[PDB]
A paper describes a structure:
An essential function of the PP2A:B55 holoenzyme is the control of cell cycle progression through mitosis. Consistent with our complementary NMR spectroscopy studies, both intrinsically disordered proteins bind PP2A:B55, but do so in highly distinct manners, leveraging multiple distinct binding sites on B55.
The interaction of FAM122A with PP2A:B55 is different to that of ARPP19, with FAM122A residues 81–111 binding PP2A:B55 with two helices. FAM122A residues C-terminal to the B55 helix form a sharp turn with helix α2 (97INRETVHEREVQTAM111, the inhibition helix) binding and blocking the PP2Ac active site. This interaction is stabilized by hydrophobic and electrostatic interactions. L96F and I97F bind a hydrophobic pocket, positioning E100F and E104F to bind substrate-coordinating residues R268C/R89C and R214C/R89C, respectively. The E104A variant only modestly weakens FAM122A inhibition (twofold; as a control, the inhibitory capacity of E106A, a solvent-accessible residue, was not affected). This suggests that interactions at the active site are not essential for PP2Ac inhibition, but instead may be due to interactions, such as those of R105F and V107F, that stabilize the helix across the active site. cBioPortal34 highlighted that FAM122A R105L, V107G variants are present in different cancers (FAM122A is a tumour suppressor, as patients with cancer who express low levels of FAM122A have significantly worse overall survival than those with high levels of expression). Although both inhibitors use helices to bind PP2Ac, these helices project in opposite directions, with ARPP19 helix α4 extending towards the PP2Ac C terminus whereas the FAM122A inhibitory helix extends towards the PP2Ac hydrophobic groove. The only area of overlap is at the active site itself, where tpS62R projects deeply into the active site, whereas E100F or E104F bind at the periphery.
Residue numbers in the entry:
A (entry chain D): 93 to 111
B (entry chain C): 2 to 298
C (entry chain A): 396 to 589
């Protein structure tokens, strides 16, 4: 399924984008 | 006197080893004394060999117990944890309390650095805030620890040759003296040096690059070679990135990543590793698998 | 007769003792005193003694811990004389190991061996090593020496405590490292030397 690392990286960016 | 507290602190450690949380009052007292110790420590903590270096543990308390079984119990074994003690694990409260408890008891034997998850913002998203509220009924304990996180050193330097930090290098940092100049007693910024030191990643791409995490930067081999030579470093010891084999050399062995949470998030199935630095500073790596969970097939 | 099985048992024991999974190595260690008792002293010395010593230097601490207690159970069966001739001279050799984890293992071994080897063997052969290590450049070794003396001190004669143990502990209290001072003080208090 979804790659392990990419799953966490995307949401980390979302949090950082929300700031 | 100090003797009575020392025995009390010893009791806490044994209690915490059994995975039993301390009371809110006890946590408050522990945090207060922790700050007094941490406030005296530099942004680049001078660490002596021999020492065992550990990556993220993310509240996986029972694998932290495995870590001690492999590497030996404190204070007999000197330890250097590179951050990320909470979130993404059922036992962040016990995990962080034990490591803070050991630091207060054995300040000289254990070093705990700040990771990107040692943050008020991040802990409110990835579970540490929820766990504290669930395990205590109010956010005071979360308030205490997050305040304590501000005092954790950003980086450590082992025998002046191996440089340890969570995230990685920064465009704003060229010399360790630049790190020593930062003001760390604050919530983790979204930009600048203190952000990069906790969020950056090594990369195959040359030079600086845009971080996919939305924070920090990716740096290529040329960056690491320049930084090591400029500062007389042999190695950059690093955390903050899941690696399946537990440790991963990169950039022609200028950088090594160490990840110490086995079967990350209970689903990755990765191996964990810890790097033991000999009395001669010669490095060695121990790989270990998740501890057999009692009553859980 | 188990002697007939010995030739077939040893290859299996060797493979288990050297298994990749440390928890497998742990399991065989727990049966070593049982196997050693059945196979006898002579077979153990020729075939199994090397395996036991190899465990003491294992990378995994848990294995070293288990092997340390394995020595006590073996000595409880084969007696003091066998331990002095076979085990003690080899464990003390680790004192010179360049790795502080392995050097500390010697202190751990002495901690459990003194419980069985008795006063005479402890004073003449094991105690001198402990006192020598008090000067180890690594603080972890030095305050383990303090802890070791605290545990084996009661087994020593009073004349030995006042003559040799007391001055060494007093020196450790002056050590720069906080932990060495603390445990040195505790050792003196427990032993009632100061
Ligand atoms: Fe991280
Ligand atoms: Zn992490």
């Amino acid at each position: 399924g979804m790659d392990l690392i990419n799953r966490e990286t995307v949401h980390e960016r979302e949090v950082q984008t929300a700031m | 006197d100090e003797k009575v507290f020392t025995k009390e602190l010893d009791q806490w450690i044994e209690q915490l080893n059994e995975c039993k949380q301390l009371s809110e009052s006890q946590v408050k007292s522990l945090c207060e004394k922790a700050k007094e110790i941490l406030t005296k420590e530099s942004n680049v903590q001078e660490v002596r060999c021999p020492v065992t270096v550990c990556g993220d543990v993310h509240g996986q308390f029972h694998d932290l117990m495995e870590l001690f079984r492999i590497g030996g119990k404190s204070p007999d074994t000197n330890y250097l944890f590179m951050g990320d003690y909470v979130d993404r694990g059922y036992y962040s409260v016990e995990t962080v309390t034990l490591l803070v408890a050991l630091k207060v008891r054995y300040r000289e034997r254990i070093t705990i650095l700040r990771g990107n998850h040692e943050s008020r913002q991040i802990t409110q998203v990835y579970g540490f805030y929820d766990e504290c509220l669930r395990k205590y009924g109010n956010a005071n304990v979360w308030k205490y620890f997050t305040d304590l996180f501000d005092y954790l050193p950003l980086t450590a330097l082992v025998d002046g040759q191996i440089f340890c930090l969570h995230g990685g290098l920064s465009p704003s940092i060229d010399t360790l003296d630049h790190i020593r100049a930062l003001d760390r007693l604050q919530e983790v910024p979204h930009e600048g040096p203190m952000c990069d030191l906790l969020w950056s990643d090594p990369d195959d791409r040359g030079g600086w690059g845009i971080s996919p995490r939305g924070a920090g930067y990716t740096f290529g081999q040329d960056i690491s070679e320049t930084f090591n030579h400029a500062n007389g470093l042999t190695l950059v010891s690093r955390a903050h990135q899941l690696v399946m084999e537990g440790y991963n050399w990169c950039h022609d062995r200028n950088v090594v990543t160490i990840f110490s949470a086995p079967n990350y998030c209970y689903r990755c199935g990765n191996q964990a590793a810890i790097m033991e630095l000999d009395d001669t500073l010669k490095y060695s790596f121990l790989q270990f698998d998740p501890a057999p969970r009692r009553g859980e097939p | 007769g188990i002697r007939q099985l010995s030739q077939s048992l040893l290859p299996a024991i060797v493979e288990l003792a050297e298994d990749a999974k440390w928890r497998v190595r742990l399991a065989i260690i727990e049966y070593m005193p049982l196997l050693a008792g059945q196979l006898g002293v002579e077979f153990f010395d020729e075939k199994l003694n090397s395996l036991c010593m190899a465990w003491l230097v294992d990378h995994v601490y848990a294995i070293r811990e288990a092997a340390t207690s394995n020595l006590k159970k073996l000595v409880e069966k084969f007696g003091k004389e066998w331990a002095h001739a076979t085990i003690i001279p080899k464990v003390l050799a680790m004192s010179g190991d360049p790795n502080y984890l392995h050097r500390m293992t010697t202190l751990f071994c002495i901690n459990v061996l003194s419980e069985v080897c008795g006063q005479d063997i402890t004073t003449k052969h094991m105690l001198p090593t402990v006192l020598r290590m008090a000067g180890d450049p690594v603080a972890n070794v030095r305050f383990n020496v303090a802890k070791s003396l605290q545990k084996i001190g009661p087994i020593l004669d009073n004349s030995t405590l006042q003559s040799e143990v007391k001055p060494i502990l007093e020196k450790l209290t002056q050590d720069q490292d906080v932990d060495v001072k603390y445990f040195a003080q505790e050792a003196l208090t427990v032993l009632s030397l100061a």
